[PDB]
Write a protein that binds this ligand. Structure first.
Ligand SMILES: Nc1ncnc2c1ncn2[C@@H]1O[C@H](COP(=O)(O)O)[C@@H](O)[C@H]1O
Ligand SMILES: Nc1ncnc2c1ncn2[C@@H]1O[C@H](COP(=O)(O)O)[C@@H](O)[C@H]1O
Lengths: 136, 131
């Protein structure tokens, strides 16, 4: 059943993505991170169609030490992985697992950002199927 | 297949739990959290047999704001959920899902802490079965 669904069917659409701007202050970033409670965030330049990388909330913790250097986006920004929306979900899960990451940026047939997908949503689909089977 | 396993079979044993002490400073907590790379931590008093609660690393972030109050353990400590070693894993998964949490403390029949169990490890069992 995983082999038959595409990432587009399970992705978080572009409009629902919680992102950070490359030049936002630490306080603004914190407001977004704390309010949304997510762990990872696409980082954009001007708009959600231009993703510069991913920020992981955990990577902020070292900058909370009493003697740490100052935070800067350049110090924590990681490269984002991009996948086409047509990718099969079983292959997406295999890729998350083998390459050891959690979030991909999803692009459509025109090259624009159509959303994001995470390994957690694939696991949610699997367990959801478990609970549906248990419902019937 | 989950119904045939017990939490004892999949738990992180007591000796391997990465914990924080109730009276640790923010710097000490950060050292443990950053080194271990975990997201959630049992909080203990004298020893791992007395769990006072759970600390979630994300709950430290509000104290990073430029105008935030000072950190203290009392501001972030969360209540811990306890389950017996004998609990069947299908029931544990149902509980994590319905109550929407990730980590439970595992105790033996005498009241001692035998370890901790997480939803991530159950999901690892499931995905392992898929692949
Ligand atoms: N930056 C984000 N924007 C929108 N949704 C997200 C984001 N990060 C995670 N999610 C969604 O929230 C779920 C829980 O992940 P998290 O909130 O990071 O624990 C994921 O499986 C996604 O469906
Ligand atoms: N505080 C902890 N002490 C020991 N193991 C943990 C702790 N938190 C999570 N784990 C385990 O470490 C692995 C990754 O979980 P996490 O670090 O929360 O992403 C899983 O096998 C968890 O069961």
């Amino acid at each position: 059943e995983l082999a038959l669904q595409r990432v587009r069917d399970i992705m978080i659409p572009r409009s629902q993505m919680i992102t950070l701007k490359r030049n936002q202050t630490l306080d603004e970033c914190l407001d977004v991170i704390i309010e949304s409670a997510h762990s990872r965030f696409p980082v954009i330049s001007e708009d959600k169609d231009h993703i510069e990388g991913i920020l992981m909330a955990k990577d902020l913790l070292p900058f909370m030490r009493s003697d740490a250097e100052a935070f800067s986006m350049d110090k924590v920004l990681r490269q984002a992985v991009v996948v086409p929306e047509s990718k099969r979900v079983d292959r997406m899960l295999k890729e998350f697992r083998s390459q050891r990451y959690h979030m991909a940026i999803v692009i459509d047939e025109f090259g624009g950002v159509s959303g994001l997908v995470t390994i957690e949503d694939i696991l949610e689909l699997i367990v959801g199927e478990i609970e549906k089977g248990q419902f019937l």
